Amino acid sequence: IIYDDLSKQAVAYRQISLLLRRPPGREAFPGDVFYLHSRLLERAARVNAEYVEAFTKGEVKGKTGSLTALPIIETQAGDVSAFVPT
């Protein structure tokens, strides 16, 4: 999976938050912007064959599944210090 400009997602969640009048944070981003990307990227996993057998109710045996993630982020003149890049 190639997520493209995950930063252009963060701007969107910020717009929703500030329109919903929630308390703003650093660079006016919502506090729970780490949780957004954290619970998105942790879905990228390799799962053992026992999980695959338990999920597929035994239809697929002995094979591991995988999801590989390649997020893309844009830096303002390369400053890693920014909130979303960090």
Binding site: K8, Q15, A28
Partner: protein, 458 residues
Amino acid sequence: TGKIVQVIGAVVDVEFPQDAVPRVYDALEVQNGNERLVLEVQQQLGGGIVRTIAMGSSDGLRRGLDVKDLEHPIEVPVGKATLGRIMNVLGEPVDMKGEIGEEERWAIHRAAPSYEELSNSQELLETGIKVIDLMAPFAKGGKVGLFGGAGVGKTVNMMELIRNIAIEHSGYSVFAGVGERTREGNDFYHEMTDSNVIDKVSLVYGQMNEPPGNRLRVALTGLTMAEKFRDEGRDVLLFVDNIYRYTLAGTEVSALLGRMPSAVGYQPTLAEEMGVLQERITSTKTGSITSVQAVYVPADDLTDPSPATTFAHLDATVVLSRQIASLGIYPAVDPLDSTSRQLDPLVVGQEHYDTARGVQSILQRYQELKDIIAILGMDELSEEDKLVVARARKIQRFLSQPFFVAEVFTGSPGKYVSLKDTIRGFKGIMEGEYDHLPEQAFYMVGSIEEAVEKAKKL
């Protein structure tokens, strides 16, 4: 049928009966003394309250004025009748000619064309300016953006593009004056009329003295007209005087609408406001819009969120810089930041790509040598680093060019340089075949011929 109940700056709140409340973006109307005022609906608040932006002067409004509910959006004259004339944000004629004999009017709020309707083209559309074509080639039906701070030439460059593009373009064109000087527009109009090309250009003006609502919605109006001429199946040229003002008008209004500030005091919806306008100025399978947009950057800060989000919406981006203008070098394009989606070996050919990358490599190396040159001077450079510096300086000077619209400043005659000439010149300079001329010979000369000739004149 409605009453004004609050008046905050350019923002007006109106109360309506619960069964009669207006839709979003409907147009309301008020008597302001002997004037007529149009209000555009932005938000529906609770209880029949509706919050609007005045498309005109807010001075002189009392509370309790009766407001009339016109049950449609702002709609503007459209089509072949709008051609050769100057118009208000509300679609009213602002030249002293008579009525616009329009057969059709369109609402300025529209949905963007579908992904299924889009089109792509590789056709190089040559522009006379040497730097733009070599570094950032621009194709017909695409978007071009001129980025620059205050007073670095992004209006004048566009006038040269207007001159050069109009040579090989036959169809109609639209010009949107958004939050800029009235004098620039007046001068433009009289240049157009004195050269009899006005019969093919349609003009909308929303200049910087007008209240925020006018400057906010004037851009959308111009897009409405450009979209008509696209949808007739033609090809259209759309020039936007300053897209930055459009976002800034939203900033000026935003806090009064009751919205928490974002980032550096901007409106929280900035990205969507920019996107919703940018996605409908595009080509389709029935016709194509070619557009040039001037993009002002505040305080010369190219990392500011408004310029930053503007970069993503363009095909060719030319970045002007004050440091180069201060050295006399015009047009003051920075070759190490100007780029195009069209600079590909397949699109422009291997020579066109190899020359541009050689120019960039040489200039980039020039930058890295500047710190040691600054501290210790040039005599401590390596014997071929000196040669790199000499060729980089020659290249920097040959990027400069006399413009036909700059005769009023330079006094020098203008120059047009075709593609099969500028890449030859730069390839020769890179290969050192013209290395023997002095630096000054390359300043403000059209072609390599004029440089060697000027060197004969010392």
